[PDB]
């Protein structure tokens, strides 16, 4: 006996399947393992086939990697345009009077194991 089956799990994209599988229709009562992508963090979760031919509703389990906010530079401050994930770039701007020394806008990225800004935070110094 095994009436009803949970249809093929929807594509997460940010998670690659990680469990023995050789069929389209999955049997209810079975968690499928999925590991997020490098640019993501939240350990390997799993969607449980409940009964209504549906997979357990996953909350905020998977989340794109994010770099730690850079310390505000002396006589200045960085403004995030949206956020600080491995894709969003933060703009640096010193308070009126002193010009920034170093770069202009560092983009948050990822090497593979750990996320880090493409360029270290500049500085600020009175303009000659």
Swiss-Prot record:
Glycan-linked positions: 22, 91
Record-annotated disulphide pairs: 6-49, 36-62, 67-108, 94-124
Domain (Sushi): residue spans on this chain: 5-64, 65-126
Subcellular location: Membrane
Origin superkingdom: Eukaryota
Tissue expression from the record: Present on erythrocytes, a subset of T cells, mature B cells, follicular dendritic cells, monocytes and granulocytes.
Family: Belongs to the receptors of complement activation (RCA) family.
Protein function: Membrane immune adherence receptor that plays a critical role in the capture and clearance of complement-opsonized pathogens by erythrocytes and monocytes/macrophages. Mediates the binding by these cells of particles and immune complexes that have activated complement to eliminate them from the circulation. Also acts in the inhibition of spontaneous complement activation by impairing the formation and function of the alternative and classical pathway C3/C5 convertases, and by serving as a cofactor for the cleavage by factor I of C3b to iC3b, C3c and C3d,g, and of C4b to C4c and C4d.
Subunit structure: Interacts (via Sushi 1 and Sushi 2 domains) with complement factor C4b. Interacts (via Sushi 8 and Sushi 9 domains) with complement factor C3b. Interacts (via Sushi 24 and Sushi 25 domains) with MBL2. Interacts with FCN2. Interacts (via Sushi 24 and Sushi 25 domains) with C1QA. Interacts with CR2.
Protein's UniProt name: Complement receptor type 1
Organism whose genome encodes this protein: Homo sapiens
Positions spanned in the full protein: 942 to 1065 of 2039
